[PDB]
Ligand binder design. Sequence first.
Ligand SMILES: OC[C@H]1O[C@H](O)[C@@H](O)[C@@H](O)[C@@H]1O
Ligand SMILES: [Ca+2]
Ligand SMILES: [Ca+2]
Length: 123
Amino acid sequence: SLCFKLYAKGKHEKKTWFESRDFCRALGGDLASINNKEEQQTIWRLITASGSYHKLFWLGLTYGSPSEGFTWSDGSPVSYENWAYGEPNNYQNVEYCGELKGDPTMSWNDINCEHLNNWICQI
Ligand SMILES: OC[C@H]1O[C@H](O)[C@@H](O)[C@@H](O)[C@@H]1O
Ligand SMILES: [Ca+2]
Ligand SMILES: [Ca+2]
């Protein structure tokens, strides 16, 4: 079993999706995968425990292909989904990575992978 770890930082420490993935892998883990409602509840509870409200976080979500759909960087299946209303929308055709809106709904949005965000590792 892995443990989720929140990285909620100021703009100077925020990372692109690829930088966040590489950071978590350097620690022996990966960006967090949310494969069912239970994992989602674990992360929400972790958000409440740290008081890290009103934040956006990279998850391990990245677009694969038409025959795969989205994928998790850790290789686990994208069975469960929790996209926000109207998402994923591939806005302007440049959104290939997934972020978590860290409020009680725990919804996902696709966004440009070069955006600087907070992130969640599984270690
Ligand atoms: O900033 C990009 C972001 O803008 C809006 O919130 C929506 O269109 C989202 O779907 C999109 O990902
Ligand atoms: Ca998982
Ligand atoms: Ca989007």
